[PDB]
Amino acid sequence: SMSQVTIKDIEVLNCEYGKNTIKFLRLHREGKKHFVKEVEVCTHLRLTSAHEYLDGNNSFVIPTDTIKNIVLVLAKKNGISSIEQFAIDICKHFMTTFCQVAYVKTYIQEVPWQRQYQNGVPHIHSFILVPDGIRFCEAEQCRNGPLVVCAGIKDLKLMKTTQSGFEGFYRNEHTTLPERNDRILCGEFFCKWSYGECRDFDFDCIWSKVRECILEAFSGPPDCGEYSPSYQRTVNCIQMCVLSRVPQVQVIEVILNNNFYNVVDMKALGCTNDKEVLVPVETPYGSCACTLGRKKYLEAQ
Amino acid sequence: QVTIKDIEVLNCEYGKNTIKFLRLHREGKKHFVKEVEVCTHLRLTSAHEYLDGNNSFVIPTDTIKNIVLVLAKKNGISSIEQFAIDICKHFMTTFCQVAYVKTYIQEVPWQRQYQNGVPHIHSFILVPDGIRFCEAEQCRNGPLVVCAGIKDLKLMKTTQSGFEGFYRNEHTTLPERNDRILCGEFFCKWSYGECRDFDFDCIWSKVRECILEAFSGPPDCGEYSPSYQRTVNCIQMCVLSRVPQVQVIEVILNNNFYNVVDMKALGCTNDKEVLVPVETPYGSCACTLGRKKYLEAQS
Amino acid sequence: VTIKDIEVLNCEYGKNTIKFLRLHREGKKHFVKEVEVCTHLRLTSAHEYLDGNNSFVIPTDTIKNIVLVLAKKNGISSIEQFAIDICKHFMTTFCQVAYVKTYIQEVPWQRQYQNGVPHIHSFILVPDGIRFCEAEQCRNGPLVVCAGIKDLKLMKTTQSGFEGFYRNEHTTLPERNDRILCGEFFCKWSYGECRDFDFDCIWSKVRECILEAFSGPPDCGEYSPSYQRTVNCIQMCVLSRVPQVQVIEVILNNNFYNVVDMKALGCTNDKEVLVPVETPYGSCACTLGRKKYLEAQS
Amino acid sequence: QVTIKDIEVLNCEYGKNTIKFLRLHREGKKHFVKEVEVCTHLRLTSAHEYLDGNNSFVIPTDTIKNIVLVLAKKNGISSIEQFAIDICKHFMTTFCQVAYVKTYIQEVPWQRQYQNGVPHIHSFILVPDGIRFCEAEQCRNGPLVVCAGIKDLKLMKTTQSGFEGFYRNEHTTLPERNDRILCGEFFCKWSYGECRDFDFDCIWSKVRECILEAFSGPPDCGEYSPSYQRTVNCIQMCVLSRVPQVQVIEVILNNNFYNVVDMKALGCTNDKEVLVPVETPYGSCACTLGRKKYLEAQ
Ligand SMILES: O=c1[nH]c(=O)c2nn[nH]c2[nH]1
Ligand SMILES: O=c1[nH]c(=O)c2nn[nH]c2[nH]1
Ligand SMILES: O=c1[nH]c(=O)c2nn[nH]c2[nH]1
Ligand SMILES: O=c1[nH]c(=O)c2nn[nH]c2[nH]1
Ligand SMILES: [Br-]
Ligand SMILES: [Br-]
Ligand SMILES: [Cl-]
Ligand SMILES: [Cl-]
Ligand SMILES: [Cl-]
Ligand SMILES: [Cl-]
Ligand SMILES: [Cl-]
Ligand SMILES: [Cl-]
Ligand SMILES: [Cl-]
Ligand SMILES: [Cl-]
Ligand SMILES: [Cl-]
Ligand SMILES: [Cl-]
Ligand SMILES: [Cl-]
């Protein structure tokens, strides 16, 4: 119909920009005892207009360099009591300082530094990297909308060697999977939960409590464990534990990426392999994901 | 144009890489796991597969994988070191066309889960706090040598570290510093030579404790490091002083500088409060120390 | 005054210092375990005290016979397993037993060696700290096992002080940052009901923790600012490195070594000649337990 | 009634007992300890302190202690034998009134601690596996004689022992036995006479090796003992064959019989499995052997 499209022909469905992987360590000294919080911050903005795209005019653009500067200044002046409070302080600063900001999102993850110990005695200033699951949070706010905070844990890899099966599934001409009532259940978990606009609690304490719920629901009691009839059922058991034990959690998303461990057939090698040697299949891999919300929280919107 | 008689075969080696498996063991309802990654390489007495297209002497890399899995099944894995020994011994004593065998093993760092200080019978969590590995090798008619190690071990102290009194030249702009963050990623490897009259797990743990303690110093005051290099030496001398089984120790320290961000132009003072890691480029230092007694004793 | 005015707070009886050697032979090679056993009972009634009625009393002679028969029939893999077997035997054999406690200590026989070769059947007494254990059970309550080391005498010649202590008008002790630290230790630890480990292995591991924490590393040692702090270092080492230990009790009986004033004798004594003071002597004692374990009891 | 005229002084002797001290020596960071118990006794050339109440010639026992401590400080202690020699020589050269001096010394058995085969610079553990002692004595204008020994040495073998073919009378109920536990606590003491041209520590260790090897026999099979008395002879003949410095050797063996408990009345057979030691009463035997040449040469 026409030889080109012009602004009049097209709708801007989304415009977003920001600064990614702002890495720094906040050091706090109480005499000779040293405290560290090392983080990675992503902060993204949507502006009220798109002249920098549509017209080649930068008048309203806050440089991403400025976004980095603000994150480092706020760390210096405010410290970091929790990554959640820091994500909140960043979002509130952008919304209050810059009228051209329609929307702000701050994602933060912690570098998993632990204090070193010598026969139970905490070291004043020495640390070791211990990645047993990465702590993150995310704060976002629309102009004239609520400031919403999420916390989570990712790269969390749990494995139980029994009390796991997958049976009674749908069968068809392309379904060769045998029924199994014993197998290794190996999952890499991404867990993310919403507090909504709630802030009246200790962020670090509540995060720890959720992490506990995830490990406990996954494992079952330490003397006997608990049967899992699917990866999916195990995801629901985790979500329902967190919701049952942590009232501040309004919505919870859990993604389980599984690895199957095959009992190697050793008959041609002159052996019987009685669930002794198991080879992980890393690709392809199965995943399942569910998001559960409290009826009260969702209806209250 | 060029023929077999103009060229010398300096080296021929082949193997199977990244053989991954979990060895499961049950004592009633209590389950135990060892998950490993194994490389095994061979040198053969002839090179006909390369020079002539004749495979008669070649043990398939598929067979190397089958043997590793069969040995894990029949022998179990008490320690990765004993399993590395078992694999090298099997190749040496089974195949007369093997001139040399090398097995590398690394553990997947599964930890048993705890609820209220009670250990879980069959539930585990992945906790990398430094990757345990080992390596066994042997030439025909030569010692079976065992090495153990820890890698991807990232240690950081926020004080008791400087670098001063260095060599000055026209291209040297580095300031002298007596307070900086010391952050290093360590690769540590040590040889037991032929000795195996000790508990591999116990001695591996002891060397690890030596590394952490020599790095950190005492927990109430720490200990001043005047260079990355001096910290490497304190680790090595601590291990050799406390672990006679260690004959030779190699330590590599890959460091990250943490820069106190100049916040002047932002109207801020930064008194060592906000520090930015420089990941690339990065400094390295490496040292191998050996006991004179062990070195001289090799005829 | 009458039985009606009087409460029986406690009644207990038993057989003490039951001494025997259990000999085991694998062809030419002999193995020994020589022990001393005490076994005490509390009965469900006190008719022997209150009425002169012995109908419920198991003779202490029978307690000895039972200890000797079980050693014969069961052998002794570990003193802890033997103590368990004796408590279990009393609880299943005699319903009038309300409570049983068995204490066992090992006679410290070591196999003799000649130029590195172990002797098939010859031993030497080597007391380097006496191994003991204790098992006890109430009727329908848990069987609890403790192991320990006593008469363990350790000494370091430096890396010991006592400074910054409370001063008053009767305090003449000077501040010291260098002294001999000499202690006789009693150490006892509870496994609770946990029994799924090698008793000998774990005992050896706790012993090594005690010596290493007392001494510090062999190339430099470790400063002790008090006997009390050294007790704490030993306990925290054991608890940090041995998960099976739930509760640990350490008693340190110290001996002061005085640098003799030889000025009157025309001599300077630069910490060269030291005289030990055996009485009076100082003691300190601490019991630490895992919070998780102590909560799980209540 | 009776006066000095009617009575003869057969013997007078006095001294200081249990003088305890530690001698500490430092080579850089490395500490060396020798802790000893010293007894020093004198006979004087007169007895006026007893007979007349005149103390003019008495050296206070407090002075004997001061001299032992002063000599430890000034000389150090290379060996307890050299220290005992130095004490006797001091009393003889210093005091006109000394007719006779005897010095007895025993070592406190401190052993350096080891961690994973590494010797600790300054930490020790008490390990009493046979107490080292010595004794020096001298009459005025007579030879200074030195003895060394080992006591409280407890050895046990579980077979290769019997006692048969002994004298029988109407009061003899002991059965012939060809297979018993041989358990002895040994006191061994030997004389070097006046010879001192050797390493005292070296030679003491050699004698101790000889006692353990002769008691035990070879590690692969042992050696049959037909009595305690013949084991004492084997020990002595082994020392005299292998250690030419030893002129005279005394060995005292205090034995403990281990009874195979008769368990027929308890429904059991006891096939040398459970044995009970008899600590009292107890048998002893003692022999002193000397080289003909040294006994003639007196
Ligand atoms: O638990 C399981 N869920 C699934 O959806 C599935 N698909 N293959 N195996 C499976 N196991
Ligand atoms: O400790 C240090 N060693 C070095 O070699 C170096 N080079 N730059 N900074 C350094 N710091
Ligand atoms: O370490 C010590 N603790 C004490 O309680 C004490 N009392 N005197 N000396 C002492 N030394
Ligand atoms: O060896 C022995 N000697 C004795 O003199 C003796 N007397 N009873 N048993 C004995 N055994
Ligand atoms: Br021996
Ligand atoms: Br030791
Ligand atoms: Cl640590
Ligand atoms: Cl497979
Ligand atoms: Cl070839
Ligand atoms: Cl856990
Ligand atoms: Cl700096
Ligand atoms: Cl060396
Ligand atoms: Cl043995
Ligand atoms: Cl002092
Ligand atoms: Cl007289
Ligand atoms: Cl007999
Ligand atoms: Cl001989």
Residue numbers in the entry:
A (entry chain DDD): 0 to 300
B (entry chain CCC): 3 to 301
C (entry chain BBB): 4 to 301
D (entry chain AAA): 3 to 300
Task: Show sentences the authors wrote.
Here we show that the Gallus gallus gene we name cysteine-rich urate oxidase (CRUOX) encodes a functional protein representing a unique case of cysteine enrichment in the evolution of vertebrate orthologous genes. CRUOX retains the ability to catalyze urate oxidation to hydrogen peroxide and 5-hydroxyisourate (HIU), albeit with a 100-fold reduced efficiency. X-ray structural analysis highlights differences in the active site compared to known orthologs and suggests a mechanism for cysteine-mediated self-aggregation under H2O2-oxidative conditions.
Of the eighteen cysteine residues of GgUox, C287, positioned directly above Q231, is in closest proximity of the “peroxo hole” whilst C14* and C289 are further away at ∼8.5 Å from C287. The X-ray structure of GgUox suggests a possible mechanism for disulfide-mediated aggregation. However, in both space groups, intermolecular contacts are, at least partly, mediated by the loop containing the sauropsid-specific C98 residue, indicating that this interaction is also favored in solution. Exposure to H2O2 also selectively oxidizes other GgUox cysteine residues.
